[PDB]
Design a protein around this ligand. Structure first.
Ligand SMILES: COC1=C(OC)Cc2c(nc(C)nc2N[C@H](C)c2ccc(-c3ccccc3CO)s2)C1
Length: 455
C-alpha cells in the first residue's frame, strides 16, 4: 500500500545503508522536532542530514561531540556514503530525496569546516579528502554551497599562519620598576597589577578553550595534547599559580613576613573580586585551603579581621554545590572570567554517571543524550567567552606569570609533600614549640593597597 510506496520510492538495503526503517532496534527518541536519545552511528548520520527538515541543534551538538564515538575519518566517509544516493518517479525522487539530503550533507560540511577546522588542521589527509569530495559536485543549487564552503576553507587557511572602547587605567607599579624583570615577585609587583595581568591572562585562556576538548574526558587520555591543548593550558596555569601561592607562603619562614605574604594574596583576591575574575578568586581560595597553608593557625591569627572575612566569604561561594557562586555569576554584568573548575567537575560527573551505550532488542546503541548533556555544559562556557577587559597589557608581568614553574624539576606529588613538610617546619604541631626564623626580605613589606590612581 501507501506505506510500502514511500519505502519502495526510497532505495533498498542491498544498495544503500541509510534508508532502513525507523524502529526500536536502531533509534530512540526522548510535538515537533524529535530529540534523539540514542541510536547506531548509521541512524545518527541519517538524522544528521534528514530530508524532511533542518536540525541545527542536532548538527551543532553532533559535530561538537562526535569524536567520543566516531573518528573524523569514519565520519567523512559516512557523510560521503550518505551523499552518494543510488538512482516521473525519478524526477520526484530527485526533487524530494536526492537534492535535499545532498543539501543537508553540504550544510554539515560547511558547519564542520567553519566551527571545527582543527580536525582538518590536525589531519592533513582529512582536508584533502574533504576538498576532493567538494570538487566532485555538479548541480544547480549545489554550486553556491561549494563556493560558500571553499570560501571558509580559504579563511581558515590564512588563519593558520587590541582596541579599547573606554580609556583603560594606568598600569600600577610598586617596588619593581618598569623593565627590572629580575626583581619581579609577589611582594615587589603591585597587587592591583598582579590581579589585572592574571585576569587578562586567564580571560584569554578561558576564551581559547573549545567544546570538543572537554568531550569524553579526552584531556585525560593518551591523546590529550593535540585533542585538548587550550584546556590543558588552563588547568596547568591554575595548578602553577595555586602552587606558586602556596610556595610563596610556606617558604616565607618568618611569621610576620608570612603574614604579609598571605595578606598580599588576599589583596590580589580582592582585586579579582572587583574584576569579576571568579577563576582567580577560587585559585586563591584553593591555595589558602590547601594542606600546607590551611593548618598555619599562627599566620591566620595575625590576618586583619576584614581580610579574614573576605577569605571566609570567598570560601562560602563553593558551599552547597556552588550555590552562592552561581547566584553571584548570574547577578553581575560583563566583563567576567567564570570559575573553570566547576565545568570540569560537572562534565566528569556526567561522563562517569551515564553509560556509553544503551541496549534495546539485544543491540548496543550509542548514548547521544550523554553527549548532548556534556555539550550543554560547554554551551554555558561559550556564553562567557566574548567579554574583553578594558585593561592594558604589560608584557613583562604577563611573561612572568605565563612562565611560573613553582614545582621546578619536581613531580607534583613530590612538590606538595615538600610544601607540607615545609609547613610542619615553620609551624610545628602541638605540643611542640614554635621557633622564630630570620627575615628573608630586605625591602619594605607594607602593601601599597588596592585603591588605584586618580585621587
Ligand atoms: C569545612 O572545612 C573548611 C575548610 O577546609 C579547608 C576551609 C574553610 C572553611 N570555612 C571557611 C569559612 N573558610 C574556609 N577557608 C577559607 C578560604 C580560609 C580562611 C582562612 C584561611 C587561612 C589562610 C591562611 C592561613 C591559615 C588559614 C586558616 O587557618 S583559609 C571550612
Amino acid at each position: 500500500g501507501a506505506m510500502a510506496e514511500e519505502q519502495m520510492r526510497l532505495p533498498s538495503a542491498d544498495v544503500y545503508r541509510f534508508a532502513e526503517p525507523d524502529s526500536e532496534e536502531n533509534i530512540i527518541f526522548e510535538a515537533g522536532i524529535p530529540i534523539i536519545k540514542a541510536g547506531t552511528v548509521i541512524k545518527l548520520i541519517e538524522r544528521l542530514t534528514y530530508h524532511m527538515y533542518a536540525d541545527p541543534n542536532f548538527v551543532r551538538t553532533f559535530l561538537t561531540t562526535y569524536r567520543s564515538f566516531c573518528k573524523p575519518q569514519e565520519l567523512l566517509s559516512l557523510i560521503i556514503e550518505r551523499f552518494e544516493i543510488p538512482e516521473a518517479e525519478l524526477k520526484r525522487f530527485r526533487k524530494e530525496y536526492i537534492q535535499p539530503v545532498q543539501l543537508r550533507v553540504l550544510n554539515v560540511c560547511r558547519h564542520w569546516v567553519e566551527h571545527h577546522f582543527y580536525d582538518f588542521e590536525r589531519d592533513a589527509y582529512l582536508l584533502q579528502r574533504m576538498e576532493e569530495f567538494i570538487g566532485t559536485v555538479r548541480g544547480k543549487a549545489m554550486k553556491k554551497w561549494v563556493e560558500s564552503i571553499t570560501k571558509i576553507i580559504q579563511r581558515k587557511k590564512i588563519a593558520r599562519d587590541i582596541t579599547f572602547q573606554s580609556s583603560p587605567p594606568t598600569v600600577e607599579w610598586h617596588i619593581s620598576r618598569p623593565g627590572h624583570i629580575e626583581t619581579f615577585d609577589l611582594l615587589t609587583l603591585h597587587p592591583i597589577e598582579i590581579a589585572r595581568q592574571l585576569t587578562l591572562l586567564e580571560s584569554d585562556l578561558y576564551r581559547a578553550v573549545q567544546p570538543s576538548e572537554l568531550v569524553g574526558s579526552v584531556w585525560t587520555k593518551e591523546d590529550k595534547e593535540i585533542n585538548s591543548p587550550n584546556l590543558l593550558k588552563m588547568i596547568r596555569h591554575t595548578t602553577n599559580l595555586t602552587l606558586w601561592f602556596e610556595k610563596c607562603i610556606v617558604e616565607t619562614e618568618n611569621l610576620e613576613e608570612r603574614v604579609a605574604v598571605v595578606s598580599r594574596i588576599i589583596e590580589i583576591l580582592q582585586v579579582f573580586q572587583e574584576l569579576n575574575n571568579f577563576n582567580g578568586v577560587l585559585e586563591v581560595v584553593s591555595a589558602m585551603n590547601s594542606s600546607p597553608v590551611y593548618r598555619l593557625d599562627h599566620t591566620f591569627e595575625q590576618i586583619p579581621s576584614r581580610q579574614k572575612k573576605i577569605l571566609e566569604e570567598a570560601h562560602e561561594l563553593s558551599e552547597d554545590h556552588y550555590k552562592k557562586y552561581l547566584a553571584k555569576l548570574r547577578s553581575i554584568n560583563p566583563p567576567c572570567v567564570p570559575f573553570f573548575g566547576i565545568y570540569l567537575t560537572n562534565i566528569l560527573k556526567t561522563e562517569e554517571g551515564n553509560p556509553e551505550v544503551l541496549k534495546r532488542h539485544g543491540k548496543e546503541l550509542i548514548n547521544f543524550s550523554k553527549r548532548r548533556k556534556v555539550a550543554e555544559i560547554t554551551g554555558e562556557i561559550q556564553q562567557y567567552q566574548n567579554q574583553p577587559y578594558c585593561l592594558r597589557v604589560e608584557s613583562d608581568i604577563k611573561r612572568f606569570f605565563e612562565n611560573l614553574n613553582p614545582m621546578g624539576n619536581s613531580m607534583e606529588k613530590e612538590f606538595t609533600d615538600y610544601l607540607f613538610n615545609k609547613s610542619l617546619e615553620i609551624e610545628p604541631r602541638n605540643p611542640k614549640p614554635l621557633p622564630r626564623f630570620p627575615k628573608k626580605y630586605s625591602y619594605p613589606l607594607k602593601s601599597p593597597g588596592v585603591r588605584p590612581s586618580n585621587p
